[PDB]
Every structure is written in structure tokens, then in C-alpha cells.
Enzyme design. Structure first.
Site, PDB file in Angstrom:
ATOM      1  CG  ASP A 226      -6.483   5.997  -1.465  1.00  0.00           C
ATOM      2  OD1 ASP A 226      -7.683   5.869  -1.144  1.00  0.00           O
ATOM      3  OD2 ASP A 226      -6.060   5.776  -2.625  1.00  0.00           O
TER       4      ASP A 226
ATOM      5  CG  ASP B 278     -16.959  -3.302   8.304  1.00  0.00           C
ATOM      6  OD1 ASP B 278     -17.264  -3.279   9.516  1.00  0.00           O
ATOM      7  OD2 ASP B 278     -16.534  -2.297   7.688  1.00  0.00           O
TER       8      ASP B 278
ATOM      9  CG  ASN C  50      -8.302   7.544  -4.845  1.00  0.00           C
ATOM     10  OD1 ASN C  50      -8.542   7.370  -3.656  1.00  0.00           O
ATOM     11  ND2 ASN C  50      -7.303   6.939  -5.467  1.00  0.00           N
TER      12      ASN C  50
ATOM     13  CG  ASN D 219     -10.963   6.548  -0.240  1.00  0.00           C
ATOM     14  OD1 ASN D 219     -12.167   6.798  -0.274  1.00  0.00           O
ATOM     15  ND2 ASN D 219     -10.096   7.057  -1.111  1.00  0.00           N
TER      16      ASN D 219
ATOM     17  CD  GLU E  41      -3.091  -0.669  -0.050  1.00  0.00           C
ATOM     18  OE1 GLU E  41      -3.049   0.460  -0.589  1.00  0.00           O
ATOM     19  OE2 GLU E  41      -3.890  -1.563  -0.398  1.00  0.00           O
TER      20      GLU E  41
ATOM     21  CB  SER F 179     -11.885  10.057  -2.188  1.00  0.00           C
ATOM     22  OG  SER F 179     -11.398   8.983  -2.973  1.00  0.00           O
TER      23      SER F 179
ATOM     24  CG  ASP G  68     -13.641   8.828  -5.563  1.00  0.00           C
ATOM     25  OD1 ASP G  68     -12.541   9.358  -5.320  1.00  0.00           O
ATOM     26  OD2 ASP G  68     -14.016   7.763  -5.038  1.00  0.00           O
TER      27      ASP G  68
END
Length: 129
Positions: free
Chosen positions: A52, A101, A46, A59, A35, A50, A48
Site C-alpha cells: 500500500d 465503483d 501486505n 494497493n 490511512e 502486495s 499477498d
């Protein structure tokens, strides 16, 4: 800060990542490697709108607030700048929320394509932990 491999394994171990939700320490070290190359100051913008942030490239759309991302949910309840400290604590705490999750570590694209299913214990070999 750029961490050594074994220094990072130690801090992650200290912060409770080994076997966290079934993911061994090597998975986390391997994720950080691909990463961010172990660089706590890594940032990646990114499409959109956004971004990281940090050693695990978390993000801004869902997980942290950077004040520059439309509709940020800030689920980890932290400014994204916290993810850029030389101290990895914030990234670990956010990573724990992310992995709890259904998606698991699959949330991390670089882990999914470089670490998943490999002999990840290699990533802590040599280390005195």
C-alpha cells in the site's frame, strides 16, 4: 512530506475531491489521517506480496504497478512511486477511479472503521479553504 490537516484539505479541495461521488471533503481528510497520518511517503507491505502506497495507502494488486506484485492490474495506470510524491495529485486521481465503483470509500479499511458515519465535517473545521 507530512501535510498539516488544513494544508491537505486545501490541496484535496483544489484537486476536486469535495463532494466527489457524494463524499464530502471531510471524508477524504479523515481517510488520509487514519490511512497514513497525512504522510505522503507512507508504505505498508501486505501478506499477498502486495504493498500500500502513499497518503491514501493505495494497493499494488489492483491500482498501481510497483513491479514487485504478481498479477498487478494497474487500473490507475501509474507506477506506485507516483503515489509517494510530495504532490498529492496522483493519489487523488487514483482515489477518484477507486471511488467511482460500487464499493465507494468502503475500499479504504481505515475510512470504513474510523470515519464512516461520523461527524466528518470536523476534519475541515478551523481551516480557511
Amino acid at each position: 512530506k507530512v501535510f498539516g490537516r488544513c494544508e491537505l484539505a486545501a490541496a484535496m479541495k483544489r484537486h476536486g475531491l469535495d463532494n466527489y461521488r457524494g463524499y464530502s471533503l471531510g471524508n477524504w481528510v479523515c481517510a488520509a489521517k487514519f490511512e497514513s497520518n497525512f504522510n505522503t511517503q507512507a508504505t505498508n507491505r501486505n501478506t499477498d506480496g502486495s504493498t500500500d502506497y502513499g497518503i491514501l495507502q493505495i494497493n499494488s494488486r489492483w491500482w498501481c504497478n510497483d513491479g514487485r506484485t504478481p498479477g498487478s492490474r494497474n487500473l490507475c495506470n501509474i507506477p506506485c512511486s507516483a503515489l509517494l510524491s510530495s504532490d498529492i495529485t496522483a493519489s487523488v486521481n487514483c482515489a477518484k477511479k477507486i471511488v467511482s465503483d460500487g464499493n465507494g470509500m468502503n475500499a479504504w479499511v481505515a475510512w470504513r472503521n474510523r470515519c464512516k458515519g461520523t461527524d466528518v465535517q470536523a476534519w475541515i473545521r478551523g481551516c480557511r479553504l
